[model samples]
Target: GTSKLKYVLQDARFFLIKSNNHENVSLAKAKGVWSTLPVNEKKLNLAFRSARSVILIFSVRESGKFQGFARLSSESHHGGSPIHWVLPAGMSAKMLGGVFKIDWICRRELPFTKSAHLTNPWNEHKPVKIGRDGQEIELECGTQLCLLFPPDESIDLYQVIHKM
Candidate 1:
């Protein structure tokens, strides 16, 4: 009898960062922005080191709308002068000029009521936490959150931006 191998799908982690500075957002869309988090450097590495590919979401501070998404290579660790993830092609335009509602990406009614739950990142200097459903996350200016989702989640890069 031949031995059978079982396959398991891996969950892709989504990292959300709040951008209060308009310049930073523009830089991120055009070139790339440093991975500067409000948390400790060691903490950021521990959270993102194992992640092969991470989905990065940037939310406008004032408007509280999702600006854009980018693919991040989390394997490399750079201190002080950190490397950044480049924006994928066509994603900038598909965002409709940096105005995407959170509901559009979530694809469902969120359990939380307030937009602050997903917008504001700095909560008394504590690390942001996401619920098991992956909807109870928050973000403050210059802060970040690590959101988890199964492979079936509709927020995949190619799926979010339909190819022409």
Candidate 2:
């Protein structure tokens, strides 16, 4: 059984902040399949591995592989920044007190996966766009309310009037 995830920040884009490029690329090389592709084109960016599970950060490809990357930033509703990282496609997550667990859809190649899906336990119906990393969500949150709309404006009329 799997739980559906609500796209709480559907309008917002997701990306990574920290990772080890050298190690990630090396892992790809060791695999012998993605060794020749540039690190950025190899289908994995950030990763953590162990016997029990593995964690990966990546952008999806049209062919379903995890590859490519770019920049992203999520501004908080309070006009501040929240510490966060974007999860990649085919990855699953559960947030309850800032603790997260991540895993790939496959384990043979581990995080160097070539398969992904738009809907998962975290985003059952609300789709998380994959294969495109060079984009950002245009909505901004209203600090006082759980609202989202295009940048520089709020759907809440009061907030709009106050902008005057």
Candidate 3:
């Protein structure tokens, strides 16, 4: 007998990083950002650990585009200013040797409509506040991290993959 699969809603967040280098983004490594900053580091690490899903976005050409999402693996490690995460089994990309043995995931690039409401605040180096509680998590200029409120409603994954 086969068991039915149960689907559970995930708490997803948007992890936006500014990148012009496709090489770096494809490599599954986010480098050159403050990884040791006490407060931000603590919160960021906690956020990544707690979040069930993370929607990765690459901010390029004055706009951001969807580049697949992934679950945070326990194998993630923190280094000088760069952090590495081991991509899940079926999600793992080819292993490439470097100073660090970090496994990355093959990401699918998807075109998304640029929203001014989302990019404007980020462009000004301001935190894009979400949620009714008005809580904000501030980080350095290059990276912007925010939780998606009403998670499922915030983004429709099916449409993102099929429609676009």
Candidate 4:
């Protein structure tokens, strides 16, 4: 297993930082996403526009460089709002560069999977083990989407209209 160290945490002041600082990205239609503000030395900030939605953002920084990103959307199961999404890759390139959807949780455990929900770590459970990459792997009842990420949800992660 590869050894890893702890990550540093940043604050919300990051949102208002300079947008042009990081290669300059102008969203064709910015809906729900985070980015650099238009300055330097500014911490990360959350940016989301919606009626009543929540975008979970877990970002850690070391000194000044970005560490990793974890974002979840509670409002995406509804409609055409990018404010709803889930990402495991934790990078703007992987998250913003590709098709985003709620793949991890659904593929692992959910009411739809017909599998018993257990809170214990997978390694401590049966048929659960870490990958060669030291990645946590959960094997339970799930769709093919469980193994194949970039879920083919038939729609984008932004479609946040709860079916149930």
Best by lDDT: 1
**Cα lDDT listed for each candidate:** 0.36, 0.24, 0.32, 0.23
Candidate 2 residues 37-153, lDDT tens each? 123222222211111111122433432323322111111112222323333443332221221222122122212232222322223323233323322222221110112111222
**Clash pairs, model 1 backbone:** 120-139, 120-140, 121-139, 121-140, 122-140
lDDT of 4: 0.23
- Best-to-worst ranking by lDDT: 1, 3, 2, 4
| TM-score, per-candidate, Cα-based | 0.40, 0.18, 0.37, 0.17
In order, what is each prediction's RMSD in angstroms?
Answer: 12.7, 18.1, 12.4, 18.0
Least well predicted 10-residue stretch by lDDT in candidate 2? 141-150
Better of 1 and 2 by TM-score: 1
lDDT string for model 1 (1-164, tens) is: 00100001123345555554556566555444334432423333454554433345555455534554454433324333322333334333222111111212322221222233434333443333221111212322222222222122544444323310
Per-residue lDDT over 46-87 for candidate 4, one digit per residue giving the tens place of the 0 to 100 score: 222321222121112111221112223321221344432332
lDDT of 3 by residue, 1-164 (tens): 00100011233433443443445455554431211223333434566566543233343333345443333333234333333433334433223122222212224443443222343233353333221111222232112222221122333344223211
lDDT of 1 at 130: 24
lDDT of 2 at 7: 28
**Candidate 2 residue runs with Cα over 4 Å from true position:** 1-27, 31-51, 57-63, 66-118, 124-164
Residue 136, model 4: lDDT of 28
